[PDB]
Amino acid sequence: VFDVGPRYTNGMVCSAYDNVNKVRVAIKKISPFEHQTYCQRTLREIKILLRFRHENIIGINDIIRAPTIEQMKDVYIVQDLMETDLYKLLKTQHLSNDHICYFLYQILRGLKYIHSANVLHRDLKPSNLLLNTTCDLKICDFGLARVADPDHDHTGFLTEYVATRWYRAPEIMLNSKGYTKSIDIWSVGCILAEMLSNRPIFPGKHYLDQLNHILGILGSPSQEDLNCIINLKARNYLLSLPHKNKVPWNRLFPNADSKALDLLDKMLTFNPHKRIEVEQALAHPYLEQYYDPSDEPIAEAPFPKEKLKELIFEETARFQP
Ligand SMILES: *CCC(=O)NCc1nn(C)c2ccccc12
C-alpha cells in the first residue's frame, strides 16, 4: 500500500508526478506507529523540517495522512525531487576540486542555519546529503537531531551511541553525549576527507575500533588535550595505548588542494573545544570563492506513543484540504 491521494501519480520511498504544481516530487512512506523510537524520531523530524526554511536543507512540500487519528496508519512526506545523494555519487564518481569546494560550501551554509537555530543534526553523512543534477545540495534526515545542551554533554567512557559509527567524533567514545555543535563539525570533516578520496576516512568495524581508526591518523592526543578529559576510565584508556604519530594529511591525500587540507585539519581536531566552528569554517580561505555571510542566512529564532501519534496528527494538520 503506497496511497498518496490522486494529487500524486506515476520505510518505502517513490518518485511521483504532482498534478497541482506541474513538477515531479519525492514521497517517503512512514509507517512509524508500531514502534516508539520510530514515533519520536518522526515527530522530531517533522517539527524541525517544517520550521526550517533554507536552500541547503530539504523541505517538506506536503504531508498525506488519513483525516482522523483512528484511520491514520501511515504518513507520507512529500519533498523536492533530488536525483541522488553524496553516498551514491561517491561510490562511482571522482569529484573535481571545484565540486568538492562547492559541496563543502553548501554543507556548511546549511549547517550554519541549523546551528543558528540551536539544533544539532547528529547524523551527518554522505547518504544524508541529497544532490540534484545541477549539484544543488540539501541536508536531510533530522530523526536524530537535538537541541544543543553543552552543560549536559558529559558522560562516562564507552557510553552507547545511536548515530552512524564512521562519522562519530572521538569524544563520543570517551566522555560526550553528542550534545554540542562540535559533534557536527567532526562529521563534516569526515565527509570532506571522503570527498577527497571516495573512501571513508575512519571505517571502524565496531564501537572502540572507531577510536583506533581516528588515533591511527591524528596520532596520540597531546598532554593538554588529555588534561581536558577528567573522566578517569577514558583518560587511562588513552594513556594505555602505544604512542602513535600523526599521518600528514598531504600523504593521505596527495592530490588534494592544500587549503582544503588546512580546513580538514581544523575540522578533524581531537579536542572538541579547539575544533573549528561552522562560521569560521565558511570564512576559511578554501571557501573564499563562495563566502558571503550576508547570503548565509540564520534562523529567525532558536528551536508515550499515544500522545506521540496525536502530536504527529496535530503537526501534520496544516496540509489537510
Ligand atoms: C535524508 C535521507 C533521505 O531521506 N533519503 C531518501 C531520499 N532519496 N532521494 C533521492 C530523496 C529526495 C528527496 C527527499 C528524500 C530523498
CA distance 16 to 279: 37
Q: What is the DSSP string of 217-235?
A: HH-SPPHHHHHT---HHHH
Which residue, 111, 275, 255, 134, is CA-closest to 195?
255
State if residue 130 touches ligand 1 by the CB under 6 angstroms criterion: yes
CA distance 106 to 56: 6
Which of 129, 140, 142, 167 for a ligand 1 pocket mutation test, highest count of atoms within 8 Å of Cβ? 140
Edge-to-edge strand list for the sheet holding 62-64:
8-9, 13-18, 23-30, 75-80, 62-64
**SS3 category, 25:** strand
Chain breaks in the chain (C to N over 2.5 A) after: 10, 303
Place of cell 552512524: 164
Angle formed by the axes of helices 258-267 and 97-116, to 10°? Answer: 30
Rounded-to-10 torsion of CA 48, 284, 273, 168: 60
79 with 59: CB under 8 angstroms? yes
145 with 179: CB under 8 angstroms? no
CA distance 308 to 199: 39
B/e letters for 198-210, b = 16+ CB within 10 Å, e = fewer, are: eebbbebeeeeeb
State if residue 141 touches ligand 1 by the CB under 6 angstroms criterion: yes
CA distance 160 to 225: 23
CA distance 69 to 312: 9
Give distance in angstroms: CA of 130 to centre of ligand 1.
6
The residue type found at 211 is L
CA distance 150 to 163: 18
- Domain boundary assignment for the chain: 1-81+304-321, 82-303
Which residue, 32, 321, 85, is CA-closest to 194?
85
Whether 123 is a known active-site residue: answer: yes
101 with 288: CB under 8 angstroms? no
Place of cell 549536559: 152
Residue 18's DSSP bridge partners are 8, 23
Give distance in angstroms: CA of 96 to centre of ligand 1.
24
CA distance 199 to 180: 27
State if residue 123 touches ligand 1 by the CB under 6 angstroms criterion: no
**SS3 category, 275:** coil
Residue 291's DSSP bridge partners are none
The residues, any chain, with a CB within 8 Å of residue 126's CB and separated by 6 or more, are: 85, 86, 87, 89, 90, 191, 194
The residue type found at 3 is D
- The protein residue whose alpha carbon is closest to atom 6 in ligand 1 is 13
Hey, what's the cell of 38?
Answer: 520510530
State if residue 232 touches ligand 1 by the CB under 6 angstroms criterion: no
Angle formed by the axes of helices 182-197 and 97-116, to 10°? Answer: 170
267 annotated ligand-binding residue? no
The residues, any chain, with a CB within 8 Å of residue 152's CB and separated by 6 or more, are: 177, 179
Helices and strands (DSSP H and E) totals, the chain: 11, 10
Method by which this entry was solved:
X-ray
Residue 174's DSSP bridge partners are none
The residues, any chain, with a CB within 8 Å of residue 6's CB and separated by 6 or more, are: 19
The residues, any chain, with a CB within 8 Å of residue 259's CB and separated by 6 or more, are: 284, 285, 286
State if residue 180 touches ligand 1 by the CB under 6 angstroms criterion: no
**SS3 category, 78:** strand
**SS3 category, 16:** strand
Place of cell 524520531: 41
∠ Cα 96 102 107 (to 5°): 125
Is domain 1-81+304-321 annotated with CATH 3.30.200.20?
A: yes
State if residue 140 touches ligand 1 by the CB under 6 angstroms criterion: yes
Residue 17's DSSP bridge partners are 9, 24
Which residue, 81, 167, 35, is CA-closest to 11?
35
221 with 238: CB under 8 angstroms? yes
CA distance 188 to 167: 8
Which of 15, 28, 135, 191 for a ligand 1 pocket mutation test, highest count of atoms within 8 Å of Cβ? 28
Which of 85, 86, 129, 131 for a ligand 1 pocket mutation test, highest count of atoms within 8 Å of Cβ? 85
- Top CATH class, 82-303: mainly alpha
Which secondary-structure segment (H or E) carries 204? none
221 with 213: CB under 8 angstroms? no
For residue 83, give the ligand 1 atom closest to its CA.
10
Residue 161's DSSP bridge partners are none
State if residue 14 touches ligand 1 by the CB under 6 angstroms criterion: no
Hey, what's the cell of 4?
Answer: 498518496
Q: What CA–CA distances, in Å, run from 299 to 48, 164, 243?
A: 12, 26, 44
**SS3 category, 135:** coil
∠ Cα 115 47 181 (to 5°): 20
Q: Which of 18, 62, 85, 123 is catalytic?
A: 123
The residue type found at 246 is K
Which residue, 56, 232, 59, 249, is CA-closest to 154?
232
Which residue, 282, 307, 278, 306, is CA-closest to 293?
282
Q: Return the beta strands (E) in 146-261 as ranges.
A: 146-147
